[PDB]
Amino acid sequence: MQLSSGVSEIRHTADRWRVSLDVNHFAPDELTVKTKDGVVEITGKHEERQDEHGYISRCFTRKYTLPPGVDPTQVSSSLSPEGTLTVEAPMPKLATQS
Amino acid sequence: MQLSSGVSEIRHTADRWRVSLDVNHFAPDELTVKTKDGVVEITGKHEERQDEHGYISRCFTRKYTLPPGVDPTQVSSSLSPEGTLTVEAPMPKLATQS
């Protein structure tokens, strides 16, 4: 920015943030990622699961409402069987509240 | 009170069973205990959390279908703010089903 001399190149690969969500370990396939105009939510729920002390199923919801401008067009998400949901992308370095 | 205690049916045959459904820690009031003919279910869902790492919420569901091991009339439940749900009571000592 401005200091073109600090980049020289017209195109560069920087300005990237990496936030992570952890839950799909309970559901790798029964997980749903939906980007809602800046609202980042991960849907994860399972049906009647067996357990040591009974039958237990739960639904998990984590909602990230980032108004500062977590760009919806440029925010993608990686998910590994570990239930590691990485949301990596370029975004407004506002880092305000939650 | 004394009641029509015509006889002293004092039978302390109360070994008593004791199982716990600890989860309401995430829900003291948002918890609903339901005993349905041997079916013990604990209804509990959290409320949109507000944390710097995300606004999260979940729902817990445990279904203990114990026909020949849990009585519907004499089963009570203890709950403490700590979200500890003890189900204590005298139960029909049955042997398998059929």
Side-chain angles (χ1 to χ4, degrees), chain B residues 26-58:
Chain B
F26 316 123
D29 210 89
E30 300 79 2
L31 176 113
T32 342
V33 199
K34 44 161 74 27
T35 320
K36 203 104 133 319
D37 180 33
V39 190
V40 166
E41 263 248 303
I42 259 54
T43 343
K45 49 142 250 50
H46 200 55
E47 224 51 53
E48 221 164 319
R49 286 233 30 71
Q50 170 184 212
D51 290 271
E52 346 302 273
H53 307 292
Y55 298 178
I56 128 214
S57 356
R58 55 260 207 72

PDB file of all heavy atoms in Angstrom, chain B residues 26-58:
ATOM      1  N   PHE B  26     -24.456 -26.005  31.524  1.00  0.00           N
ATOM      2  CA  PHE B  26     -24.649 -25.050  30.452  1.00  0.00           C
ATOM      3  C   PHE B  26     -26.103 -24.603  30.409  1.00  0.00           C
ATOM      4  O   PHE B  26     -26.515 -23.906  29.481  1.00  0.00           O
ATOM      5  CB  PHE B  26     -24.280 -25.664  29.088  1.00  0.00           C
ATOM      6  CG  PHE B  26     -22.983 -26.440  29.176  1.00  0.00           C
ATOM      7  CD1 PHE B  26     -22.954 -27.795  28.814  1.00  0.00           C
ATOM      8  CD2 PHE B  26     -21.812 -25.805  29.600  1.00  0.00           C
ATOM      9  CE1 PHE B  26     -21.755 -28.511  28.878  1.00  0.00           C
ATOM     10  CE2 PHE B  26     -20.613 -26.523  29.666  1.00  0.00           C
ATOM     11  CZ  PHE B  26     -20.584 -27.875  29.304  1.00  0.00           C
ATOM     12  N   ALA B  27     -26.898 -25.051  31.379  1.00  0.00           N
ATOM     13  CA  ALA B  27     -28.310 -24.717  31.400  1.00  0.00           C
ATOM     14  C   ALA B  27     -28.963 -25.062  32.730  1.00  0.00           C
ATOM     15  O   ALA B  27     -29.476 -26.167  32.910  1.00  0.00           O
ATOM     16  CB  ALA B  27     -29.033 -25.438  30.265  1.00  0.00           C
ATOM     17  N   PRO B  28     -29.004 -24.120  33.637  1.00  0.00           N
ATOM     18  CA  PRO B  28     -29.669 -24.308  34.949  1.00  0.00           C
ATOM     19  C   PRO B  28     -31.188 -24.288  34.805  1.00  0.00           C
ATOM     20  O   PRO B  28     -31.884 -25.169  35.318  1.00  0.00           O
ATOM     21  CB  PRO B  28     -29.185 -23.115  35.778  1.00  0.00           C
ATOM     22  CG  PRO B  28     -28.849 -22.055  34.780  1.00  0.00           C
ATOM     23  CD  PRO B  28     -28.411 -22.779  33.505  1.00  0.00           C
ATOM     24  N   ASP B  29     -31.701 -23.277  34.094  1.00  0.00           N
ATOM     25  CA  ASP B  29     -33.143 -23.157  33.888  1.00  0.00           C
ATOM     26  C   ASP B  29     -33.543 -23.711  32.539  1.00  0.00           C
ATOM     27  O   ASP B  29     -34.634 -24.272  32.385  1.00  0.00           O
ATOM     28  CB  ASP B  29     -33.581 -21.695  33.994  1.00  0.00           C
ATOM     29  CG  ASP B  29     -34.999 -21.623  34.517  1.00  0.00           C
ATOM     30  OD1 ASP B  29     -35.163 -21.577  35.717  1.00  0.00           O
ATOM     31  OD2 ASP B  29     -35.906 -21.633  33.714  1.00  0.00           O
ATOM     32  N   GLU B  30     -32.655 -23.588  31.577  1.00  0.00           N
ATOM     33  CA  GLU B  30     -32.899 -24.095  30.239  1.00  0.00           C
ATOM     34  C   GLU B  30     -32.746 -25.614  30.213  1.00  0.00           C
ATOM     35  O   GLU B  30     -32.275 -26.192  29.224  1.00  0.00           O
ATOM     36  CB  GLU B  30     -31.924 -23.441  29.249  1.00  0.00           C
ATOM     37  CG  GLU B  30     -32.103 -21.907  29.252  1.00  0.00           C
ATOM     38  CD  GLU B  30     -31.406 -21.264  30.451  1.00  0.00           C
ATOM     39  OE1 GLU B  30     -30.789 -21.976  31.225  1.00  0.00           O
ATOM     40  OE2 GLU B  30     -31.490 -20.060  30.570  1.00  0.00           O
ATOM     41  N   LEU B  31     -33.176 -26.251  31.291  1.00  0.00           N
ATOM     42  CA  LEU B  31     -33.130 -27.696  31.414  1.00  0.00           C
ATOM     43  C   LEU B  31     -34.519 -28.208  31.740  1.00  0.00           C
ATOM     44  O   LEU B  31     -35.245 -27.591  32.521  1.00  0.00           O
ATOM     45  CB  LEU B  31     -32.138 -28.098  32.513  1.00  0.00           C
ATOM     46  CG  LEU B  31     -32.151 -29.631  32.740  1.00  0.00           C
ATOM     47  CD1 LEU B  31     -30.817 -30.239  32.308  1.00  0.00           C
ATOM     48  CD2 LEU B  31     -32.347 -29.904  34.221  1.00  0.00           C
ATOM     49  N   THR B  32     -34.903 -29.299  31.119  1.00  0.00           N
ATOM     50  CA  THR B  32     -36.220 -29.857  31.321  1.00  0.00           C
ATOM     51  C   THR B  32     -36.123 -31.365  31.546  1.00  0.00           C
ATOM     52  O   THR B  32     -35.736 -32.119  30.636  1.00  0.00           O
ATOM     53  CB  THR B  32     -37.104 -29.537  30.100  1.00  0.00           C
ATOM     54  OG1 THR B  32     -36.511 -28.472  29.357  1.00  0.00           O
ATOM     55  CG2 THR B  32     -38.503 -29.120  30.556  1.00  0.00           C
ATOM     56  N   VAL B  33     -36.447 -31.797  32.763  1.00  0.00           N
ATOM     57  CA  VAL B  33     -36.381 -33.212  33.116  1.00  0.00           C
ATOM     58  C   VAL B  33     -37.703 -33.894  32.777  1.00  0.00           C
ATOM     59  O   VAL B  33     -38.770 -33.402  33.151  1.00  0.00           O
ATOM     60  CB  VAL B  33     -36.075 -33.373  34.621  1.00  0.00           C
ATOM     61  CG1 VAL B  33     -35.536 -34.780  34.901  1.00  0.00           C
ATOM     62  CG2 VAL B  33     -35.022 -32.338  35.051  1.00  0.00           C
ATOM     63  N   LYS B  34     -37.638 -35.013  32.062  1.00  0.00           N
ATOM     64  CA  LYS B  34     -38.851 -35.731  31.675  1.00  0.00           C
ATOM     65  C   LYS B  34     -38.693 -37.232  31.869  1.00  0.00           C
ATOM     66  O   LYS B  34     -37.789 -37.853  31.303  1.00  0.00           O
ATOM     67  CB  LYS B  34     -39.225 -35.428  30.207  1.00  0.00           C
ATOM     68  CG  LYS B  34     -37.965 -35.484  29.316  1.00  0.00           C
ATOM     69  CD  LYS B  34     -38.362 -35.646  27.841  1.00  0.00           C
ATOM     70  CE  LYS B  34     -38.919 -34.329  27.276  1.00  0.00           C
ATOM     71  NZ  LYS B  34     -38.344 -33.156  28.013  1.00  0.00           N
ATOM     72  N   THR B  35     -39.609 -37.817  32.620  1.00  0.00           N
ATOM     73  CA  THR B  35     -39.619 -39.252  32.836  1.00  0.00           C
ATOM     74  C   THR B  35     -40.782 -39.848  32.072  1.00  0.00           C
ATOM     75  O   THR B  35     -41.943 -39.508  32.333  1.00  0.00           O
ATOM     76  CB  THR B  35     -39.747 -39.563  34.336  1.00  0.00           C
ATOM     77  OG1 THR B  35     -38.950 -38.643  35.072  1.00  0.00           O
ATOM     78  CG2 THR B  35     -39.273 -40.996  34.617  1.00  0.00           C
ATOM     79  N   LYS B  36     -40.483 -40.669  31.082  1.00  0.00           N
ATOM     80  CA  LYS B  36     -41.520 -41.223  30.237  1.00  0.00           C
ATOM     81  C   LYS B  36     -41.473 -42.757  30.215  1.00  0.00           C
ATOM     82  O   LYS B  36     -40.785 -43.355  29.390  1.00  0.00           O
ATOM     83  CB  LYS B  36     -41.379 -40.640  28.821  1.00  0.00           C
ATOM     84  CG  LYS B  36     -42.726 -40.719  28.086  1.00  0.00           C
ATOM     85  CD  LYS B  36     -43.377 -39.321  28.048  1.00  0.00           C
ATOM     86  CE  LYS B  36     -43.872 -39.006  26.630  1.00  0.00           C
ATOM     87  NZ  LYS B  36     -42.871 -39.473  25.631  1.00  0.00           N
ATOM     88  N   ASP B  37     -42.233 -43.371  31.126  1.00  0.00           N
ATOM     89  CA  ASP B  37     -42.324 -44.837  31.233  1.00  0.00           C
ATOM     90  C   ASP B  37     -40.977 -45.515  31.033  1.00  0.00           C
ATOM     91  O   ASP B  37     -40.757 -46.203  30.038  1.00  0.00           O
ATOM     92  CB  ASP B  37     -43.338 -45.400  30.233  1.00  0.00           C
ATOM     93  CG  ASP B  37     -43.422 -46.917  30.368  1.00  0.00           C
ATOM     94  OD1 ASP B  37     -43.255 -47.413  31.469  1.00  0.00           O
ATOM     95  OD2 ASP B  37     -43.658 -47.565  29.371  1.00  0.00           O
ATOM     96  N   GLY B  38     -40.090 -45.333  31.983  1.00  0.00           N
ATOM     97  CA  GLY B  38     -38.780 -45.959  31.916  1.00  0.00           C
ATOM     98  C   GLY B  38     -37.829 -45.168  31.044  1.00  0.00           C
ATOM     99  O   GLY B  38     -36.612 -45.339  31.130  1.00  0.00           O
ATOM    100  N   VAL B  39     -38.371 -44.285  30.211  1.00  0.00           N
ATOM    101  CA  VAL B  39     -37.518 -43.477  29.361  1.00  0.00           C
ATOM    102  C   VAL B  39     -37.121 -42.201  30.086  1.00  0.00           C
ATOM    103  O   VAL B  39     -37.959 -41.316  30.319  1.00  0.00           O
ATOM    104  CB  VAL B  39     -38.223 -43.153  28.036  1.00  0.00           C
ATOM    105  CG1 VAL B  39     -37.225 -42.516  27.058  1.00  0.00           C
ATOM    106  CG2 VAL B  39     -38.776 -44.449  27.422  1.00  0.00           C
ATOM    107  N   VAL B  40     -35.845 -42.118  30.460  1.00  0.00           N
ATOM    108  CA  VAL B  40     -35.330 -40.951  31.157  1.00  0.00           C
ATOM    109  C   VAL B  40     -34.620 -40.023  30.164  1.00  0.00           C
ATOM    110  O   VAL B  40     -33.596 -40.402  29.573  1.00  0.00           O
ATOM    111  CB  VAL B  40     -34.356 -41.378  32.283  1.00  0.00           C
ATOM    112  CG1 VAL B  40     -33.550 -40.169  32.787  1.00  0.00           C
ATOM    113  CG2 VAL B  40     -35.143 -41.971  33.454  1.00  0.00           C
ATOM    114  N   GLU B  41     -35.169 -38.822  29.977  1.00  0.00           N
ATOM    115  CA  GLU B  41     -34.583 -37.839  29.058  1.00  0.00           C
ATOM    116  C   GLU B  41     -34.338 -36.520  29.769  1.00  0.00           C
ATOM    117  O   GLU B  41     -35.175 -36.041  30.546  1.00  0.00           O
ATOM    118  CB  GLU B  41     -35.504 -37.618  27.827  1.00  0.00           C
ATOM    119  CG  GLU B  41     -35.055 -38.464  26.605  1.00  0.00           C
ATOM    120  CD  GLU B  41     -34.529 -37.544  25.518  1.00  0.00           C
ATOM    121  OE1 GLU B  41     -35.259 -36.668  25.107  1.00  0.00           O
ATOM    122  OE2 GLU B  41     -33.415 -37.755  25.079  1.00  0.00           O
ATOM    123  N   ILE B  42     -33.200 -35.923  29.458  1.00  0.00           N
ATOM    124  CA  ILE B  42     -32.819 -34.643  30.009  1.00  0.00           C
ATOM    125  C   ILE B  42     -32.726 -33.627  28.880  1.00  0.00           C
ATOM    126  O   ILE B  42     -31.860 -33.723  28.008  1.00  0.00           O
ATOM    127  CB  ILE B  42     -31.470 -34.765  30.791  1.00  0.00           C
ATOM    128  CG1 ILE B  42     -31.762 -34.835  32.317  1.00  0.00           C
ATOM    129  CG2 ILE B  42     -30.550 -33.554  30.491  1.00  0.00           C
ATOM    130  CD1 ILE B  42     -32.748 -35.949  32.628  1.00  0.00           C
ATOM    131  N   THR B  43     -33.645 -32.689  28.883  1.00  0.00           N
ATOM    132  CA  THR B  43     -33.705 -31.670  27.848  1.00  0.00           C
ATOM    133  C   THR B  43     -32.902 -30.448  28.279  1.00  0.00           C
ATOM    134  O   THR B  43     -33.232 -29.818  29.284  1.00  0.00           O
ATOM    135  CB  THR B  43     -35.173 -31.271  27.607  1.00  0.00           C
ATOM    136  OG1 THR B  43     -36.047 -32.277  28.159  1.00  0.00           O
ATOM    137  CG2 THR B  43     -35.441 -31.124  26.103  1.00  0.00           C
ATOM    138  N   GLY B  44     -31.830 -30.129  27.544  1.00  0.00           N
ATOM    139  CA  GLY B  44     -30.995 -28.987  27.907  1.00  0.00           C
ATOM    140  C   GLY B  44     -30.337 -28.350  26.696  1.00  0.00           C
ATOM    141  O   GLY B  44     -29.625 -29.012  25.939  1.00  0.00           O
ATOM    142  N   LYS B  45     -30.541 -27.049  26.544  1.00  0.00           N
ATOM    143  CA  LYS B  45     -29.931 -26.299  25.456  1.00  0.00           C
ATOM    144  C   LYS B  45     -29.359 -24.998  25.982  1.00  0.00           C
ATOM    145  O   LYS B  45     -29.984 -24.315  26.794  1.00  0.00           O
ATOM    146  CB  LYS B  45     -30.946 -26.022  24.355  1.00  0.00           C
ATOM    147  CG  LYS B  45     -32.232 -25.452  24.966  1.00  0.00           C
ATOM    148  CD  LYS B  45     -32.794 -24.374  24.039  1.00  0.00           C
ATOM    149  CE  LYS B  45     -32.632 -22.984  24.678  1.00  0.00           C
ATOM    150  NZ  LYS B  45     -31.225 -22.782  25.152  1.00  0.00           N
ATOM    151  N   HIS B  46     -28.181 -24.659  25.514  1.00  0.00           N
ATOM    152  CA  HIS B  46     -27.496 -23.457  25.947  1.00  0.00           C
ATOM    153  C   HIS B  46     -28.046 -22.240  25.227  1.00  0.00           C
ATOM    154  O   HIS B  46     -28.818 -22.370  24.270  1.00  0.00           O
ATOM    155  CB  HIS B  46     -25.999 -23.594  25.678  1.00  0.00           C
ATOM    156  CG  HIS B  46     -25.237 -22.633  26.536  1.00  0.00           C
ATOM    157  ND1 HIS B  46     -25.374 -22.592  27.914  1.00  0.00           N
ATOM    158  CD2 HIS B  46     -24.317 -21.677  26.225  1.00  0.00           C
ATOM    159  CE1 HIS B  46     -24.549 -21.636  28.373  1.00  0.00           C
ATOM    160  NE2 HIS B  46     -23.881 -21.048  27.385  1.00  0.00           N
ATOM    161  N   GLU B  47     -27.674 -21.065  25.707  1.00  0.00           N
ATOM    162  CA  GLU B  47     -28.146 -19.820  25.126  1.00  0.00           C
ATOM    163  C   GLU B  47     -26.986 -19.063  24.477  1.00  0.00           C
ATOM    164  O   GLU B  47     -25.922 -18.921  25.088  1.00  0.00           O
ATOM    165  CB  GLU B  47     -28.804 -18.961  26.221  1.00  0.00           C
ATOM    166  CG  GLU B  47     -30.118 -18.360  25.704  1.00  0.00           C
ATOM    167  CD  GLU B  47     -30.997 -19.441  25.093  1.00  0.00           C
ATOM    168  OE1 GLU B  47     -31.244 -20.426  25.761  1.00  0.00           O
ATOM    169  OE2 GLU B  47     -31.405 -19.268  23.963  1.00  0.00           O
ATOM    170  N   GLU B  48     -27.197 -18.600  23.228  1.00  0.00           N
ATOM    171  CA  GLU B  48     -26.180 -17.864  22.469  1.00  0.00           C
ATOM    172  C   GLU B  48     -25.099 -17.286  23.375  1.00  0.00           C
ATOM    173  O   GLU B  48     -25.280 -16.224  23.987  1.00  0.00           O
ATOM    174  CB  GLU B  48     -26.850 -16.742  21.666  1.00  0.00           C
ATOM    175  CG  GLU B  48     -26.222 -16.658  20.273  1.00  0.00           C
ATOM    176  CD  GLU B  48     -27.108 -15.851  19.342  1.00  0.00           C
ATOM    177  OE1 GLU B  48     -28.309 -16.020  19.400  1.00  0.00           O
ATOM    178  OE2 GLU B  48     -26.576 -15.077  18.578  1.00  0.00           O
ATOM    179  N   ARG B  49     -23.969 -17.973  23.439  1.00  0.00           N
ATOM    180  CA  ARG B  49     -22.852 -17.518  24.249  1.00  0.00           C
ATOM    181  C   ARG B  49     -22.242 -16.279  23.632  1.00  0.00           C
ATOM    182  O   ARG B  49     -22.346 -16.064  22.424  1.00  0.00           O
ATOM    183  CB  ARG B  49     -21.767 -18.604  24.318  1.00  0.00           C
ATOM    184  CG  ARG B  49     -22.189 -19.758  25.243  1.00  0.00           C
ATOM    185  CD  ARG B  49     -21.086 -20.019  26.286  1.00  0.00           C
ATOM    186  NE  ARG B  49     -20.369 -18.774  26.593  1.00  0.00           N
ATOM    187  CZ  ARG B  49     -20.927 -17.789  27.295  1.00  0.00           C
ATOM    188  NH1 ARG B  49     -22.132 -17.931  27.785  1.00  0.00           N
ATOM    189  NH2 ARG B  49     -20.271 -16.679  27.477  1.00  0.00           N
ATOM    190  N   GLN B  50     -21.572 -15.488  24.445  1.00  0.00           N
ATOM    191  CA  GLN B  50     -20.891 -14.323  23.960  1.00  0.00           C
ATOM    192  C   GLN B  50     -19.452 -14.348  24.427  1.00  0.00           C
ATOM    193  O   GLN B  50     -19.137 -13.915  25.539  1.00  0.00           O
ATOM    194  CB  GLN B  50     -21.585 -13.059  24.435  1.00  0.00           C
ATOM    195  CG  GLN B  50     -20.719 -11.824  24.127  1.00  0.00           C
ATOM    196  CD  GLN B  50     -21.395 -10.599  24.696  1.00  0.00           C
ATOM    197  OE1 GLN B  50     -21.275  -9.505  24.150  1.00  0.00           O
ATOM    198  NE2 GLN B  50     -22.089 -10.715  25.777  1.00  0.00           N
ATOM    199  N   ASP B  51     -18.583 -14.850  23.580  1.00  0.00           N
ATOM    200  CA  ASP B  51     -17.162 -14.929  23.906  1.00  0.00           C
ATOM    201  C   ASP B  51     -16.312 -14.466  22.739  1.00  0.00           C
ATOM    202  O   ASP B  51     -16.692 -14.608  21.576  1.00  0.00           O
ATOM    203  CB  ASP B  51     -16.755 -16.351  24.337  1.00  0.00           C
ATOM    204  CG  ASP B  51     -17.362 -16.671  25.690  1.00  0.00           C
ATOM    205  OD1 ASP B  51     -16.720 -16.385  26.678  1.00  0.00           O
ATOM    206  OD2 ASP B  51     -18.455 -17.194  25.725  1.00  0.00           O
ATOM    207  N   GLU B  52     -15.194 -13.850  23.065  1.00  0.00           N
ATOM    208  CA  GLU B  52     -14.300 -13.278  22.076  1.00  0.00           C
ATOM    209  C   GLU B  52     -13.940 -14.285  20.990  1.00  0.00           C
ATOM    210  O   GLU B  52     -13.528 -13.907  19.895  1.00  0.00           O
ATOM    211  CB  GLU B  52     -13.021 -12.741  22.735  1.00  0.00           C
ATOM    212  CG  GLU B  52     -13.173 -12.639  24.271  1.00  0.00           C
ATOM    213  CD  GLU B  52     -14.338 -11.733  24.660  1.00  0.00           C
ATOM    214  OE1 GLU B  52     -14.126 -10.546  24.757  1.00  0.00           O
ATOM    215  OE2 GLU B  52     -15.429 -12.240  24.851  1.00  0.00           O
ATOM    216  N   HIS B  53     -14.065 -15.560  21.307  1.00  0.00           N
ATOM    217  CA  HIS B  53     -13.727 -16.612  20.357  1.00  0.00           C
ATOM    218  C   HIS B  53     -14.928 -17.049  19.570  1.00  0.00           C
ATOM    219  O   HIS B  53     -14.846 -18.004  18.809  1.00  0.00           O
ATOM    220  CB  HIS B  53     -13.162 -17.818  21.070  1.00  0.00           C
ATOM    221  CG  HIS B  53     -12.032 -17.395  21.953  1.00  0.00           C
ATOM    222  ND1 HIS B  53     -10.837 -16.921  21.441  1.00  0.00           N
ATOM    223  CD2 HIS B  53     -11.896 -17.361  23.317  1.00  0.00           C
ATOM    224  CE1 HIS B  53     -10.039 -16.625  22.483  1.00  0.00           C
ATOM    225  NE2 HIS B  53     -10.638 -16.873  23.649  1.00  0.00           N
ATOM    226  N   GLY B  54     -16.041 -16.377  19.755  1.00  0.00           N
ATOM    227  CA  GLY B  54     -17.244 -16.742  19.023  1.00  0.00           C
ATOM    228  C   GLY B  54     -18.487 -16.756  19.907  1.00  0.00           C
ATOM    229  O   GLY B  54     -18.406 -17.069  21.096  1.00  0.00           O
ATOM    230  N   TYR B  55     -19.659 -16.555  19.288  1.00  0.00           N
ATOM    231  CA  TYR B  55     -20.923 -16.706  20.007  1.00  0.00           C
ATOM    232  C   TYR B  55     -21.409 -18.144  19.739  1.00  0.00           C
ATOM    233  O   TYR B  55     -21.726 -18.486  18.591  1.00  0.00           O
ATOM    234  CB  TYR B  55     -22.025 -15.717  19.491  1.00  0.00           C
ATOM    235  CG  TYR B  55     -21.690 -14.223  19.672  1.00  0.00           C
ATOM    236  CD1 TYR B  55     -22.608 -13.271  19.200  1.00  0.00           C
ATOM    237  CD2 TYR B  55     -20.500 -13.788  20.276  1.00  0.00           C
ATOM    238  CE1 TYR B  55     -22.338 -11.905  19.326  1.00  0.00           C
ATOM    239  CE2 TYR B  55     -20.237 -12.409  20.399  1.00  0.00           C
ATOM    240  CZ  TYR B  55     -21.155 -11.478  19.924  1.00  0.00           C
ATOM    241  OH  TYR B  55     -20.894 -10.133  20.047  1.00  0.00           O
ATOM    242  N   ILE B  56     -21.367 -19.008  20.751  1.00  0.00           N
ATOM    243  CA  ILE B  56     -21.715 -20.430  20.549  1.00  0.00           C
ATOM    244  C   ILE B  56     -22.942 -20.854  21.370  1.00  0.00           C
ATOM    245  O   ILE B  56     -23.181 -20.337  22.464  1.00  0.00           O
ATOM    246  CB  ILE B  56     -20.477 -21.350  20.894  1.00  0.00           C
ATOM    247  CG1 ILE B  56     -20.868 -22.470  21.905  1.00  0.00           C
ATOM    248  CG2 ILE B  56     -19.345 -20.511  21.495  1.00  0.00           C
ATOM    249  CD1 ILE B  56     -19.697 -22.780  22.849  1.00  0.00           C
ATOM    250  N   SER B  57     -23.626 -21.890  20.889  1.00  0.00           N
ATOM    251  CA  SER B  57     -24.723 -22.506  21.633  1.00  0.00           C
ATOM    252  C   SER B  57     -24.918 -23.935  21.156  1.00  0.00           C
ATOM    253  O   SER B  57     -24.565 -24.278  20.018  1.00  0.00           O
ATOM    254  CB  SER B  57     -26.043 -21.709  21.506  1.00  0.00           C
ATOM    255  OG  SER B  57     -25.809 -20.515  20.765  1.00  0.00           O
ATOM    256  N   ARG B  58     -25.423 -24.773  22.036  1.00  0.00           N
ATOM    257  CA  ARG B  58     -25.615 -26.179  21.729  1.00  0.00           C
ATOM    258  C   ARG B  58     -26.889 -26.706  22.387  1.00  0.00           C
ATOM    259  O   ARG B  58     -27.503 -26.018  23.212  1.00  0.00           O
ATOM    260  CB  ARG B  58     -24.401 -26.969  22.213  1.00  0.00           C
ATOM    261  CG  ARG B  58     -24.175 -26.691  23.695  1.00  0.00           C
ATOM    262  CD  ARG B  58     -23.052 -25.656  23.874  1.00  0.00           C
ATOM    263  NE  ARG B  58     -22.386 -25.839  25.162  1.00  0.00           N
ATOM    264  CZ  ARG B  58     -21.585 -26.875  25.392  1.00  0.00           C
ATOM    265  NH1 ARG B  58     -21.393 -27.763  24.458  1.00  0.00           N
ATOM    266  NH2 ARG B  58     -20.995 -27.004  26.545  1.00  0.00           N
TER     267      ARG B  58
END
